[PDB]
Write a protein that binds this ligand. Structure first.
Ligand code: MET
Ligand SMILES: [Co+2]
Ligand SMILES: [Co+2]
Ligand code: NA
Length: 282
């Protein structure tokens, strides 16, 4: 199983004119980065809708993960699930991104572009989907095995899922945001994995990346305290190898320099009055 290279991008997939686009579609940047971290009750309830739809899309596309399938196909499936439920795929036209979800195989850390790449026996495939509906986003991802995956890679996926759910369980009002990355990086280090530092979780609401940053490593200098109504993602990328990466000339696809494999999981979370709610629960 050799290092991946780009395949053929299929043309831009249509979205029915009736489905409202985020403001940033077509534009080189997005109007985001200064939105409130705590959401109104209206936006929280809308975020439950968007979260459930994104979770649905992710689960539909994950079911298609099998040897012989292309990344493009997974995109087709997610895109059609979103459009059928009246959601806009938030990645489509986000800063020029050409597709409806991100598909990241093996050594690809994140941000892979669905294309003619054919999945083979033993691969690990992250699908990251975001839904825009009711003026709000819902963002989720998971790494799926394709055929007979090596124990080393089954364990990386299972331990990344676990690091994610452990971090989710720390979320409660009055706790320091920094606890999340402490819990993840401790669990990853227990098995001699390395957490990706350059890519982080984010606040999400009426905007995709609202300015709130959630680190997945231990950084106790962050002073932010979790507050009821705060919405953000936890989305650690966990590497078997070193952290050093390259970005392909597509300007998106991020790959490990040593070509060792890496896994990621993501939910969108609400800080409740007493704990957490997973908005992107299936
Ligand atoms: C740099 S755009 C990445 C989109 C992805 N859905 C995320 O979780 O942010
Ligand atoms: Co995502
Ligand atoms: Co995200
Ligand atoms: Na990967």
């Amino acid at each position: 199983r050799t290092a991946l290279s780009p395949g053929v991008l299929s043309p831009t997939r249509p979205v029915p004119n009736w489905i409202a686009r985020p403001e940033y579609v077509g534009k080189p940047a997005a109007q985001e980065g200064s939105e409130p971290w705590v959401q109104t009750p209206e936006v929280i309830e809308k975020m439950r809708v968007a979260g459930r739809i994104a979770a649905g899309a992710l689960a539909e596309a994950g079911k298609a993960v099998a040897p012989g399938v292309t990344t493009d196909e997974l995109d087709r499936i997610a895109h059609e699930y979103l459009v059928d439920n009246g959601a806009y795929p938030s990645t489509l036209g986000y800063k020029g991104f050409p597709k409806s979800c991100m598909t990241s195989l093996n050594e690809v850390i994140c941000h892979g572009i669905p294309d003619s790449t054919v999945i083979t026996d033993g691969d690990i495939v992250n699908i990251d989907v975001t839904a825009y509906i009711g003026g709000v986003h819902g963002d989720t991802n998971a790494t799926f095995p394709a055929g007979d995956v090596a124990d080393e890679h089954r364990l990386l996926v299972d331990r990344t899922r676990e690091a994610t759910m452990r971090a989710i369980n720390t979320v409660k009002p009055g706790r320091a945001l920094s606890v999340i990355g402490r819990v993840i990086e401790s669990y990853a280090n227990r098995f001699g994995y390395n957490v990706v530092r350059d890519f982080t979780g984010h606040g999400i609401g009426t905007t995709f990346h609202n300015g709130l940053v959630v680190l997945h490593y231990d950084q106790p200098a962050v002073e932010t305290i979790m507050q009821p109504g705060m919405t953000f993602t936890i989305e650690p990328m966990i590497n078997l190898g070193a952290l050093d990466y390259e970005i392909w000339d597509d300007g998106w696809t991020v790959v490990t320099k040593d070509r060792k494999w890496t896994a990621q999981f993501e939910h969108t979370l609400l800080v409740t009055d007493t704990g957490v709610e997973i908005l992107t629960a299936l």
